[PDB]
Scaffold this active site. Structure first.
Site, PDB file in Angstrom:
ATOM      1  CB  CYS A 277     -43.930  10.628  35.132  1.00 38.01           C
ATOM      2  SG  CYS A 277     -42.902  11.319  33.796  1.00 38.01           S
TER       3      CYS A 277
ATOM      4  CE  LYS B 197     -35.155   9.304  26.276  1.00 37.14           C
ATOM      5  NZ  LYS B 197     -34.900  10.778  25.863  1.00 37.14           N
TER       6      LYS B 197
ATOM      7  NE  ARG C 142     -40.436  17.662  27.904  1.00 38.51           N
ATOM      8  CZ  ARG C 142     -39.931  16.428  27.807  1.00 38.51           C
ATOM      9  NH1 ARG C 142     -38.738  16.245  27.191  1.00 38.51           N
ATOM     10  NH2 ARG C 142     -40.601  15.383  28.294  1.00 38.51           N
TER      11      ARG C 142
HETATM   12  C1  LIG Z   1     -42.301   8.754  27.888  1.00 37.80           C
HETATM   13  C2  LIG Z   1     -42.560   9.753  29.001  1.00 37.80           C
HETATM   14  O1  LIG Z   1     -43.269   9.127  30.082  1.00 37.80           O
HETATM   15  C3  LIG Z   1     -41.282  10.327  29.584  1.00 37.80           C
HETATM   16  N1  LIG Z   1     -41.614  10.981  30.852  1.00 37.80           N
HETATM   17  C4  LIG Z   1     -40.697  11.350  28.664  1.00 37.80           C
HETATM   18  O2  LIG Z   1     -41.145  12.478  28.612  1.00 37.80           O
HETATM   19  N2  LIG Z   1     -39.669  10.950  27.950  1.00 37.80           N
HETATM   20  S1  LIG Z   1     -39.013  11.882  26.858  1.00 37.80           S
HETATM   21  O3  LIG Z   1     -37.900  11.163  26.247  1.00 37.80           O
HETATM   22  O4  LIG Z   1     -38.548  13.062  27.520  1.00 37.80           O
HETATM   23  C5  LIG Z   1     -40.012  12.230  25.637  1.00 37.80           C
HETATM   24  C6  LIG Z   1     -41.002  11.325  25.245  1.00 37.80           C
HETATM   25  C7  LIG Z   1     -41.852  11.580  24.177  1.00 37.80           C
HETATM   26  C8  LIG Z   1     -41.741  12.808  23.495  1.00 37.80           C
HETATM   27  C9  LIG Z   1     -40.730  13.713  23.874  1.00 37.80           C
HETATM   28  C10 LIG Z   1     -40.667  15.036  23.167  1.00 37.80           C
HETATM   29  C11 LIG Z   1     -39.935  16.047  23.768  1.00 37.80           C
HETATM   30  C12 LIG Z   1     -39.847  17.342  23.229  1.00 37.80           C
HETATM   31  C13 LIG Z   1     -40.545  17.588  22.050  1.00 37.80           C
HETATM   32  C14 LIG Z   1     -40.537  18.935  21.427  1.00 37.80           C
HETATM   33  N3  LIG Z   1     -39.842  19.965  21.954  1.00 37.80           N
HETATM   34  N4  LIG Z   1     -41.235  19.073  20.295  1.00 37.80           N
HETATM   35  C15 LIG Z   1     -41.931  18.066  19.750  1.00 37.80           C
HETATM   36 CL1  LIG Z   1     -42.765  18.368  18.255  1.00 37.80          CL
HETATM   37  N5  LIG Z   1     -41.991  16.797  20.244  1.00 37.80           N
HETATM   38  C16 LIG Z   1     -41.333  16.520  21.397  1.00 37.80           C
HETATM   39  C17 LIG Z   1     -41.391  15.237  21.972  1.00 37.80           C
HETATM   40  C18 LIG Z   1     -39.889  13.460  24.956  1.00 37.80           C
HETATM   41 ZN   LIG Z   2     -42.784   9.624  32.119  1.00 34.14          ZN
END
Ligand SMILES: C[C@@H](O)[C@H](N)C(=O)NS(=O)(=O)c1cccc(-c2ccc3c(N)nc(Cl)nc3c2)c1
Ligand SMILES: [Zn+2]
Ligand SMILES: C[C@@H](O)[C@H](N)C(=O)NS(=O)(=O)c1cccc(-c2ccc3c(N)nc(Cl)nc3c2)c1
Ligand SMILES: [Zn+2]
Lengths: 398, 409
Positions: A93, A224, A122
């Site tokens: 973002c 969300k 992360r």
């Molecule tokens: C949708 C984005 O714009 C928003 N900024 C965002 O990051 N939202 S979020 O809920 O944190 C999000 C969205 C999509 C994927 C994830 C996510 C987070 C951690 C992950 C992780 N540690 N491992 C894997 Cl395999 N996938 C993941 C996917 C998080």
């Molecule tokens: Zn975002």
């Protein structure tokens, strides 16, 4: 069936302890990842998105400004150069806002839908890591939509439509929706949160979607919607998500000239449809038990000779299929035909073409499948045309 | 003219002080980047390469094993988690070897050609940064070929052929070539270096390529053939490179079962054809002064009206060209036709389709180009077929054009 075991068996990927949560995609796993990118792009075209690529790291100062540092510090990898500290991005973002901020914007530019296959890192605690479902380096099929308050309903609806549209290709029968509300650490006024939570709840009900609250689980910048999918053990994994942000753009000095000439801050919708590519591939691997639909299959066709009498014919068909856009390999090994078939079957290759003398003479091929179906002798152009049709249509079975 | 100026003019990318040497690719710049990836992939397919992806970071312990930590420390970004130190990768080779090391390999698996669009970070001194040509975060069109000693000649030759094949698409034929020999800080014995350097020199000589030695400029792990391209000020930039490595596979415990059931260590050839995608885009931008070939142009066609009257027709055509796979935009503004043409010329749009009342009548378009050329009226279907052919063949030049814009003749 566990995606981790299937991933090893089909040579899709591996992980090692010199890089916990860091995926090594082997050729066949990378093929799937790339096909999913193609699919997402085709949809981003029709739903009218830009596609960008943001910096892998940015100054800690910028992450302090957004609230990421105070509200997100422990999750971030940091690195230094020339006495300056950088965060490796956990989200796309802020980079998208920086791109938005280049060049004056007006209402003419909105809604501005900005997508990225955004590689994030992360620092997830190592005890929470799990296969491809929870890693440390992942790629989101991310986008941020910059729009006016008046455009929120249509743009949120658009994101919800996109989720169900894309998910229908994969045929998911269990899609559980959550609405995650204001967390303990957040930015934005309580009044902003009341409006954003209501706008999402109302969007869900207008789309006839039953949902459950997840109290306190929203992002620090906004609530969300989460589209939850389930693995073979019925564990819940957030995949799709749609989030409403009235705070980050302001913190990053985003503005545009409105239709009425008043300069305003754009609303930002954050969304991912698949979630992360890694998590989504983990889900697909379990959903199909490694029997990927043809369009996703790492190798779609293997062509085999019985003896070297049919080598030349096999090579000719292989080139013919490859030129037709099919992922095809020749198996010319000095091994019994029943040995070859079994190998490709266990590898879940959708189609196996066997050429003996009868096939050479007639210009046909004997066709069988990874489910043990015997489709008998088929003319070569018809197998090509059927394959192309099933690939192009991304058919869920056949 | 400098690519940084052209990059702003065409809205390709930007950079900021919050992220020194980290590119922000805007939509139109990313379009070019993605088309180059598609082009490289067409060649990976034809030349029979796998394509993989290795992770951004790995334990410092692994980087110490390779000789990178000793010989490459200053350039590496490091980060940590739970009391372990990680290096953000400056090269993709060690990750490729980790992939190779999964599962028993045999001589039957060789040559194994493993490509990656490999995202690298090198902590280049901020004083040395220059636009797209020297950044900190860049993407190599990388590969490593794991092969036997007997396969070196054929595989090095294959890499050399691939460089000229790909560069020919861009009209780069007379390439300046160097052979960069053992640097002061290196791993491997003198014997190994003599052999690797002779093998590369013999390959160049066998391909009838004139070259010069560049003493002491080889990688710590092996010598490098370098293919140089030049920018607007004739500064030399390393783009293509082909390198021979008898050191890293052994350091990383790579082996395969040979024909006599004996354990052998594979030879590794490293190569990048474009070099980095960023630097290669910088080079193209300057060489073509922004007149990218149609297949690369962020916007291939602009369709424009004269008055509000032709807006419906322009919109129909824009949709039609878009369904035909062409990158097309409509320009519906109340501006004079000459004004529009000047703007889209500065934006380097290959073709401009002008729609007056007579064009609406006849189902035709008035065709202009960014080089000032008036191609008359043509049928919409004819324009589409010709554009599609120009795109599919990755043609360097436009409809009825002798010479595309390029600085070095
Ligand atoms: C949708 C984005 O714009 C928003 N900024 C965002 O990051 N939202 S979020 O809920 O944190 C999000 C969205 C999509 C994927 C994830 C996510 C987070 C951690 C992950 C992780 N540690 N491992 C894997 Cl395999 N996938 C993941 C996917 C998080
Ligand atoms: Zn975002
Ligand atoms: C060919 C590879 O396998 C090999 N391991 C390798 O990295 N060789 S290399 O000579 O160092 C090399 C190859 C290709 C690109 C580069 C390179 C290095 C730094 C760069 C930088 N700082 N900026 C930019 Cl834009 N491009 C760059 C390209 C270096
Ligand atoms: Zn290398």
């Amino acid at each position: 069936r566990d995606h981790r075991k299937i991933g090893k068996q089909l040579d899709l990927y591996h992980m090692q302890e010199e890089a916990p949560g860091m995926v090594f995609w082997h050729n066949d796993g990378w093929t799937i990842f790339r096909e999913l990118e193609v699919f997402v792009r085709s949809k981003l075209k029709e739903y009218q998105y830009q596609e960008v690529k943001g910096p892998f790291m940015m100054d800690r100062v910028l992450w302090e400004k957004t609230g990421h540092w105070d509200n997100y510090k422990d999750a971030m990898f940091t690195t230094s150069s020339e006495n300056r500290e950088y965060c490796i991005k956990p989200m796309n973002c802020p980079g998208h806002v920086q791109i938005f901020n280049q060049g004056l914007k007006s209402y003419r530019d909105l809604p501005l839908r900005m997508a990225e296959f955004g590689s994030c890192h992360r620092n997830e605690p190592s005890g929470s890591l799990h296969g491809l479902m929870r890693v440390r380096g992942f790629t989101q099929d991310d986008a941020h939509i910059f729009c006016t308050e008046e455009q929120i309903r249509d743009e949120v609806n658009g994101c919800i439509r996109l989720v169900y549209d894309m998910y229908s290709t994969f045929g998911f029968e269990k899609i559980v929706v959550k609405l995650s509300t204001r967390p303990e650490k957040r930015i934005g006024s309580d009044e902003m949160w009341d409006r954003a939570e209501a706008d999402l709840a109302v969007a869900l009900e207008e789309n006839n979607i039953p949902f459950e609250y997840q109290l306190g689980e929203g992002a620090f910048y906004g609530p969300k919607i989460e589209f939850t999918l389930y693995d073979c053990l019925d564990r819940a994994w957030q995949c799709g998500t749609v989030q409403l942000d009235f705070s980050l753009p302001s913190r990053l000095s985003a503005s545009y000239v409105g239709e009425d000439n008043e300069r305003k801050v754009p609303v930002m919708i954050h969304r991912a449809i698949l979630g992360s590519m890694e998590r989504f591939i983990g889900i697909l691997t379990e959903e199909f038990a490694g029997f990927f639909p043809t369009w996703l299959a790492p190798v779609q066709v293997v062509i085999m000779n019985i003896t070297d009498s049919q080598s030349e014919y096999v090579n000719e068909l292989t080139q013919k299929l490859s030129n037709a856009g099919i992922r095809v390999k020749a198996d010319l090994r000095n091994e019994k035909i029943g040995f070859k078939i079994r190998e490709h079957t266990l590898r879940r290759v959708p189609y196996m073409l066997v050429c003996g003398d009868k096939e050479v003479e007639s210009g046909k091929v004997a066709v069988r499948t990874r489910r043990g179906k015997d489709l008998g002798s088929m003319d070569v152009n018809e197998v090509i045309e059927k394959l192309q049709q099933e690939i192009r249509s991304r058919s869920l079975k056949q």
